Amino acid sequence: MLTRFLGPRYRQLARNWVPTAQLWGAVGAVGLVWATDWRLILDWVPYINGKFK
Amino acid sequence: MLTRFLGPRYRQLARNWVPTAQLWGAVGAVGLVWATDWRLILDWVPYINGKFK
Amino acid sequence: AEPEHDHRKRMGLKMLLMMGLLLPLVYAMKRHKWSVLKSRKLAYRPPK
Amino acid sequence: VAPTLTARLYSLLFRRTSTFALTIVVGALFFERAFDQGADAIYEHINEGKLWKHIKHKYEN
Amino acid sequence: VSASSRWLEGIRKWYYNAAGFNKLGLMRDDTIHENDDVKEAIRRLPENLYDDRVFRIKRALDLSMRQQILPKEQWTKYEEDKSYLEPYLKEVIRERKEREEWAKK
Amino acid sequence: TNIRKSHPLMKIVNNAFIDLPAPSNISSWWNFGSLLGICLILQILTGLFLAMHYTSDTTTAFSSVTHICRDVNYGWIIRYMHANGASMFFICLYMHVGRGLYYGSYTFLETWNIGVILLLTVMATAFMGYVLPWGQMSFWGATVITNLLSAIPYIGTNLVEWIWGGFSVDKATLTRFFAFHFILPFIIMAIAMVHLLFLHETGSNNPTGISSDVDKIPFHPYYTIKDILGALLLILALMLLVLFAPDLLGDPDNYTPANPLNTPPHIKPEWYFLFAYAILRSIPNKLGGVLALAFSILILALIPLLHTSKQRSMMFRPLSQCLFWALVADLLTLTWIGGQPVEHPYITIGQLASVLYFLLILVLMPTAGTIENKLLKW
Amino acid sequence: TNIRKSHPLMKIVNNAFIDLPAPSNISSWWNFGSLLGICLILQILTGLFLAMHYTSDTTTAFSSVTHICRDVNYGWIIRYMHANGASMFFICLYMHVGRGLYYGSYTF
Amino acid sequence: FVLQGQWMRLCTSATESEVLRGKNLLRNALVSHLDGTTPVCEDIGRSLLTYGRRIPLAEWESRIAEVDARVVREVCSKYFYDQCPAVAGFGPIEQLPDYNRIRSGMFWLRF
Amino acid sequence: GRQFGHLTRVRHVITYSLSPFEQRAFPHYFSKGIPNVLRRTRACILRVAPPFVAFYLVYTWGTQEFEKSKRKNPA
Amino acid sequence: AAKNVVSQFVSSMSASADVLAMSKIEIKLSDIPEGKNMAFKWRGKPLFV
Ligand code: HEM
Ligand code: HEM
Ligand code: HEM
Ligand code: HEM
Ligand SMILES: COC1=C(OC)C(=O)C(C/C=C(/C)CCC=C(C)C)=C(C)C1=O
Ligand SMILES: COC1=C(OC)C(=O)C(C/C=C(\C)CCC=C(C)C)=C(C)C1=O
Ligand SMILES: COC1=C(OC)C(=O)C(C/C=C(\C)CCC=C(C)C)=C(C)C1=O
Incomplete structure (x- = not known):
């Protein structure tokens, strides 16, 4: 009955x-x-590589 | 000024x-x-002498 | 007796630098909002 | 490159609360790093007693 | 009348100046603490005085806010200090006291 | 209609922090109410994290406190924030009460009387707090204090032994104090809400002591941000204390584990009770000392009955200002004396200061109000 | 005016337990709300007295619980009131939710 | 609250149907007003002073016709969104919201 | 309670205000500012200061008497 | 009933494994020379001889 918002x-x-x-x-x-x-996501950002490897 | 109640x-x-x-x-x-x-006060009551002496 | 001694003073250093940045800023935020009141001008205009 | 400067910041990023937030969050990330290293180095200079000595003992592991 | 009365009068003038409500353009009666007797007297004020009293309080709260004070010439001068509330307050008290006497019998 | 104004839950918020009509001229001195609010939460939060490692047993009490500072990650700040926050809680508490006194705020009877209950409660709370580490000062502090109650005629011995859970401050006594120190701050909070409930019937007072209905502003931009700026100032003070001088207000002896045979020559409270401590020992009597100790705090409940001035605040009253500042100065003397041995100078000055405290509040301040009224021809 | 109706504190009480308009036909099943109220306080009270002797350390945890039942005066009832009250709290909780479900009360 | 709520809604979320109504109300107003020698004479005089031309109804129509929702939310944004208002109050105004709050109602945190 | 619109009765008072984005947060800050603090200080020293020095004095004397007392010449 | 539950909770804050009081310490007098105050632990309290 959510056909009201269509x-x-x-x-x-x-x-x-x-x-x-x-x-x-x-x-x-x-x-x-x-x-x-977030290690996984962060490591890709140019600066903010404060986890060296 | 409590002379109101006198x-x-x-x-x-x-x-x-x-x-x-x-x-x-x-x-x-x-x-x-x-x-x-209340030991002191109670001991005088006839019954309720449940502290013998 | 106090193994945390150094690390605490490193945080304390940072606490002073943060505060020295934060304090003026929050003050300016608050003054900006209080502006409306500080420069408000009143006038009384009764009948007759 | 000065009047138009804070003007651009407002135009491109502060107008919408969307960008405003996105910018301070993107701005919190970089700032954290710059303040941390920048303050560590100030704590580093006024001292030189802790792990500057490390070069000696270790390496022999 | 003479030397002594003026001395008590100048001591009163001195306290007045020290009290410092004058500096915020206030009058003595504008500073009275509001209990019932007083709340009633305010109520009984005529339109003009009531309006003037609100403007004064407003002028002072505003000054008090930015912790400023009025230029010296605009301070209220002692005994140019109209005690506008007094007669009303007096009568309201007199009325209450009569109720109180009746309540005793 | 809005959403803030109508929703059952948001209403409460709106009526207390958003649309609340506030006087336009309240100054810092009015900030200590929110600052006490922050201190209460800060005490609860660091207090909970400490409870996640603390042990309430005499065998491991001190050790668990030590375990926290060396081993528990960041356990040390949490511990010092707690300790120093308790002091921050008293500095704010004292500003707050004083502000109320100077400004006539006490005329809101219920609000103020509830405030007295709040003072007593955090006092009872902090006393039990200090015993928890089981240091020499914790134990001897616990001892000296509780034993006061033994001066109460015919009931005192049984009363002291009842709260002790023995004939001394032992195992039963520490665990006991943990439990009460855990539940008390929650009750405080419920009371702080009732405090704020009564406060809302009138709204705030202001420096002039004159009604401000004529010039109210929303709490919504003005006092939210002024409280913010102020909490930041509370953080500075607290952090300055904890990250640079965490023992400055602390006693180096509470670092030596409790020893029921070793009585330190020292033996004094935490600074926040030093004035009351000074008043207590000024009396060469067991009953009177504790009767007057109590009265030095419960007197705040007599204050509204001793208001004698026709004006509410002290802003316009010079003579009263001097007497007020002499009360604060007399309270420095009292704490200073309280932190000193009962030997030469100290006995007679701390004895006279005690008399002055009560002569001031009970006789001098009221008399000044009558004089001031008279000078104004009122 | 009254005193109950006007006083800031008593108002709340009055509006919640005195003059509160209630339906004339609610039955037992509506009692579990107050019963949960009682169970909550009962759990807190016996819970506090237990905390006055209980130790949170693995070395003495069990022992302190035992210390309570043998040595602490009336420590045993307090301990069992606590334990059994927790179950009473769940029986009431379950009645309450079920009552809501059967009766459509969830529409609030 | 409701007034400001409408300006922002239009600044950000203006929909198409309501814009046609707006355009329609405007076409009727224009033409209903230019009825009689008097309003038209006035229109000519005023136009020339402000436009240098007389703008024919067909052109006003063209300008109206071109307005769609996107234009409304862009044009309202430019003038209303996060701008300082001039406020004037008279009468029993104790409840006129404080200026900061009126100013804070000129933008939205949703957006 | 309280609310706005039910506080009190006020008549004939105009209030000119200006938007915070059009004025400065710190106008004559040092210029008008410092004179004001000095003036506020003058206004209050004679009421705040004296009690405190009386303690300052009682403190230093009190300490001297105590320390000087635990010393002794003849007898 | 109220008495009883209240009394019981009140009583829970008194006795225990705290009935001890044995001690009755025997003290060797020749261990304390003239002018010395020797303290001992007696029934959880300091005892001066
Ligand atoms: C947990 C302790 C307390 C808390 C959380 C608390 C909280 C507050 C808050 C939030 C305010 C409003 C803002 C302000 O003026 O500061 C206030 C005002 C007030 N409090 Fe407290 N306070 C506490 C202790 C006290 C004490 C110890 C007293 C004095 C016995 C007190 C009596 C007052 C009074 C009379 C006011 C009204 C002041 C005025 O409007 O001028 N409260 N309090
Ligand atoms: C319910 C929230 C609170 C909890 C859970 C709590 C828990 C604790 C615990 C476990 C300790 C022992 C650990 C230690 O000594 O650091 C302690 C010490 C203490 N707490 Fe609390 N407390 C709370 C609120 C308070 C309050 C309201 C105060 C009063 C300002 C307070 C003042 C103290 C003091 C003075 C100490 C002893 C000094 C020290 O830190 O060593 N705490 N608390
Ligand atoms: C600490 C746990 C709870 C307490 C103290 C509590 C307290 C109460 C009280 C006092 C009432 C009014 C009297 C009554 O009908 O019983 C009530 C009614 C209600 N409660 Fe709870 N209850 C609690 C848990 C629940 C649960 C678990 C639910 C279901 C998720 C629930 C949903 C309701 C509903 C819908 C009503 C309205 C019933 C009606 O009027 O017919 N509450 N509750
Ligand atoms: C803040 C009030 C409460 C306090 C201070 C408290 C404290 C305690 C303590 C110290 C214990 C360990 C002693 C023992 O096992 O007998 C315990 C056990 C337990 N409590 Fe609580 N509790 C409180 C409220 C609750 C609540 C709300 C519940 C949930 C109905 C609850 C259910 C339990 C259960 C199931 C046990 C373990 C079973 C047992 O009695 O052996 N208590 N509690
Ligand atoms: C042993 O060191 C001491 C403390 O530290 C543990 C204190 O805290 C206090 C004072 C404490 C209180 C609670 C006084 C208030 C009493 C009433 C009835 C309000 C004294 C005297 C003291 O000697
Ligand atoms: C208009 O006067 C008032 C202020 O300006 C001086 C305040 O700052 C506050 C702040 C109070 C807060 C934030 C609540 C804290 C309480 C608890 C239990 C956390 C209140 C109530 C107030 O009335
Ligand atoms: C008209 O319907 C209602 C009842 O009849 C079924 C009740 O019995 C109660 C009883 C609730 C109490 C006593 C409060 C307990 C809550 C706490 C936090 C202790 C309420 C509220 C109610 O609305």
């Missing part, structure tokens, strides 16, 4: 909020990465 | 509440006595 306006709504939902996810990611010191 | 009515008030303030004190006393098992 139409052109809602489709326009979703798009208007995508760059924002996408940028919020970049915030969440880097934020998770930097806070746990 | 007069015939307040004097009548005090008396009307005396038997009550007195009986409340009897309640408080026996209540204290029976709850701590």
Whole structure:
């Protein structure tokens, strides 16, 4: 019965909020990465190679 | 400046509440006595001589 | 008696540098927001 | 390259709260490293008593 | 009347200046602590005085906030210091005291 | 409608930290309320992490405390943050009470009286805290203190032995003190909420002591950030203490394990009780000493009855200011004396300062208020 | 005005246990909320008294629990009230959730 | 709160249907107003002082027709998003929100 | 309780304000600033300072008497 | 009932493996010369001879 949110306006709504939902996810990611010191993900970043090898 | 509560009515008030303030004190006393098992005070009561000597 | 001695002073050094950076900044943040009030001007205009 | 400078920072990154956050998080990452090494080296210079001595004892393992 | 009265009057003037409400354009009655008797007297004030009293308090709280003070010429001068509240407060107290006498009998 | 304003949970937040009408002119001195808030949480958080390694048994008590500082990762800061936070909690507590006294804030009876209960509670809390490491000062402090209660006629011996769990400060006594030191700060918090509940019926007082309904501002940009800036200042003070001088306010003797046969020549409280300690020993009597010790704290409950001035604050009252500062100065003397042996100078000055403390609050300050009223023709 | 209705502290009590409009037909099954309330306090109280003798060290943990049941005056009931109260807390908890499920209470 | 909430919504999430309504309300306003010798005469005089031309209805239509949601959220953003307002209050205004709060309602943390 | 809009009655008071983004956070900071602190200091020294020196003096004397007392010449 | 549960919780803070009091220490007098105060441990308390 979630057919209430299915139409052109809602489709326009979703798009208007995508760059924002996408940028919020970049915030969440880097934020998770930097806070746990994600070895796997971090080692690829040019500077911040404070784990030598 | 507690001279507000000094007069015939307040004097009548005090008396009307005396038997009550007195009986409340009897309640408080026996209540204290029976709850701590006041040796000194209890030993005089006829029955309740469950401390023999 | 105090094995942590050195490491603590290294943190303490960092605590002083951080504070020296943070203190003025938070102060400026707070002054900026208090601005509205500090320069507010009042006027009394009664009838007659 | 000065009036337009904080202007660009605002235009490209501070306007949206999206970027604003992304920038301080990207900004927290680099800063941590620069402050850490930068302050270690200041703690390093005013001393020279700890593990500068390491070169001796070890290596013989 | 003479030397002595002026000396007590100048001691009072001295305390006044030291008290420093004048520096914030306040009047003595603007500094009174608000109990019921006082809350009622404020209520009984006429429109003009009430409005003036709020502006003064506001002027002072504002000054007190930025910890500044008024230029010396705008300080309230002692005995140019109208005790606008007094007569109202006095009557409110007198009214309360009568209630109190009646409450004793 | 909004979301903040209507939601059952958020309402409470909104009405306490967002839209709360606050006076526009409160100064630092009003920050100590939030700072006590921070100190309370800081004490609870570092307090919990310590409880994850601490042992409440005399056999391993000291050792577990040592285990924390050498072996437990970052156990040492946590331990010193705890120790120094307790002192920070008392500096803030004292500022707060003093602020209330100078400014007339005590006229909010329930708020203030609840505040007295909060003072007593953190005091009872910190005393039990200090015994936990089981140092020489922990044990002899525990001994000297509890034994005071033996001056209470006919009930005192049984009372002291009841809280001891024996005839001395032993095994039963340490574990006991752990449990109470764990539960007390939670109760404190529930009371701090009731404190804030009563405070909300009127809102805050301000430096002038004059009503501020005429000029209120939202707590929402102004006091959130001013409290923030202020907590940062509390952190500086605390961290300066812990990362540079962690024993400065501490006693080097509580580092020697408890020895029920070795009485140190020293024997003094933690600094925050030194004034009360000085008042206690100024009296050549067992009962009177503890009767006056108690009265030096419970007197805060008599203060609102001794308000005599027609103005609320001290901002406009010079004579009263002098008397107030003489109270603070007298309290330095009291702590200083309290931290000194009961030999020459010290006895008579600490004896007279005790009289002054009570002459000041009980007679001098009220009399000044009457005089001041008179000078103003009020 | 009253005293119950107006006092900041008593209001809360009044609005929660005195004048609170309650449905006239709730049955036992509605009692488990107050019973969980009692179990919570019972767990805290006996829990505190146990903490006055219990040791958190592997060396003396069991022994301290034994010390309580033989040596500590009335230590044994306190210990069993604690243990059994934890079970009572779960019987009530389960009644409560079930009551909510049967009756549709979850719609809140 | 509601006023500001609408400006931001439009700054960020303006949808197409409402923009057609806006355009439609505007086409009606334009034409309904230019009814009678008086409003038109006024229109001619004022236009020439400000535009140097008389802008024919067909052109205003063209300019209106070109507006879609994207334009609204871009044009509203430019003028409203995170900008300082001029606020004027008169009457019983104890509850007029503080300036900082009105200023903080000019941007959104969602966005 | 409290709220805004139910505090008190105020009439005929205008309040001009300016946005925080249009003014400086530290206007005459050292210029007007320092004079003010000196003035605030003058206003209060005579009320704060004296009690404290009285202690300062009682402290140094108190210490001297004590230390000098644990010494002795004849008898 | 209230008495009893309250009394029991109150009593839980007194006795234990703390009934000890044996001691009755025998002290050799020739070990303490003239002018000396020798302290011993007696019933958990210091005893001066
Ligand atoms: C756990 C200890 C305490 C906490 C958490 C606490 C928290 C607070 C908070 C948050 C405020 C509002 C902001 C402020 O003025 O600082 C406040 C104000 C106040 N507190 Fe406390 N406080 C505590 C201890 C005390 C003590 C010891 C007293 C004095 C017996 C006290 C009496 C007051 C009074 C009268 C006010 C009103 C002050 C005014 O508005 O001018 N409280 N407190
Ligand atoms: C419920 C939160 C708290 C817990 C769980 C807690 C737990 C502990 C523990 C396990 C110890 C022994 C470890 C040690 O000595 O470092 C201790 C010591 C102490 N705590 Fe707490 N405590 C809490 C809140 C407080 C409060 C409110 C105060 C009062 C400011 C306080 C002041 C002290 C003091 C003075 C000491 C002894 C000094 C020292 O650190 O060595 N703590 N606490
Ligand atoms: C510490 C555990 C709990 C306590 C103290 C607690 C306390 C209460 C109290 C006092 C009531 C009102 C009287 C009653 O109907 O019983 C209540 C009702 C309710 N509780 Fe709990 N309860 C707890 C656990 C739960 C659980 C586990 C659930 C289910 C997830 C639950 C969901 C409900 C619901 C929906 C109601 C409304 C029932 C109705 O009105 O018909 N609560 N609770
Ligand atoms: C903060 C209040 C509580 C405290 C201070 C506390 C403290 C203790 C202590 C010291 C023990 C070890 C002594 C023993 O085993 O008898 C224990 C055991 C236990 N407690 Fe708690 N507890 C509290 C609340 C709870 C709660 C809420 C529950 C959950 C119903 C709970 C369930 C248990 C259980 C199941 C045991 C182990 C079984 C046993 O009694 O041997 N207690 N508790
Ligand atoms: C042995 O060293 C001492 C302490 O450190 C352990 C103290 O803490 C105190 C004072 C403590 C309190 C709780 C006084 C308050 C009493 C009441 C009734 C409020 C004294 C005197 C002391 O000698
Ligand atoms: C308008 O006056 C007030 C302030 O300005 C001086 C405050 O700063 C605070 C701060 C209080 C906080 C953050 C709550 C802390 C309490 C606990 C139990 C954690 C309150 C309540 C207040 O009324
Ligand atoms: C009208 O419905 C209700 C009842 O009848 C079924 C209750 O019996 C209770 C009892 C709740 C109590 C006594 C509070 C206990 C909570 C704690 C944290 C101790 C409530 C709230 C209620 O709403």
